[PDB]
């Protein structure tokens, strides 16, 4: 199984805590408590409707992975190389 919910921050050491649901490249949820401005108050926020926040880093990285895999699979793997320079 692959983890989807992540806990960011602690109650005592930080003044922010969050449970973020990350699906692939998409931040599907961000459920956040902020202990601000005073040390006895607390405000609360969370995603709105069925929204996806795209983490562009993850999409891009995934694209590059796809391209590399393509470079490897776009070959007849019964293909003898001619020079060593081709392999390099």
């Amino acid at each position: 199984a692959k983890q989807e919910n992540f806990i960011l921050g602690s109650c005592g050491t930080d003044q922010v805590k969050g449970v973020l649901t990350l699906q692939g490249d998409a931040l599907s949820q961000a459920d956040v408590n902020l202990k601000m401005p005073r040390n006895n108050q607390l405000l609360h926020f969370a995603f709105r409707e069925d929204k996806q926040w795209k983490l562009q880093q993850i999409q891009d990285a995934r694209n590059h992975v796809s391209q590399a895999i393509y470079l490897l699979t776009s070959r007849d793997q019964s293909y003898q190389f001619k020079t060593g320079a081709e392999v390099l």
Partner: protein, 46 residues
């Protein structure tokens, strides 16, 4: 004006796995390159 900054973070296990895979793959590639260069510098690949 920014009055305070709060930063929290968490390890993402599958992202971590991905990075490990990238690094290891890079290493495999460099090792192969090194062997190919070492061999080819003296002999023909074919």
């Amino acid at each position: 004006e920014v009055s305070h900054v709060h930063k929290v973070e968490c390890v993402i296990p599958w992202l971590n796995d991905a990075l490990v895979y990238f690094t290891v793959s890079l290493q495999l590639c460099q090792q192969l390159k090194d062997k190919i260069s070492v061999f080819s510098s003296y002999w023909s690949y074919r």
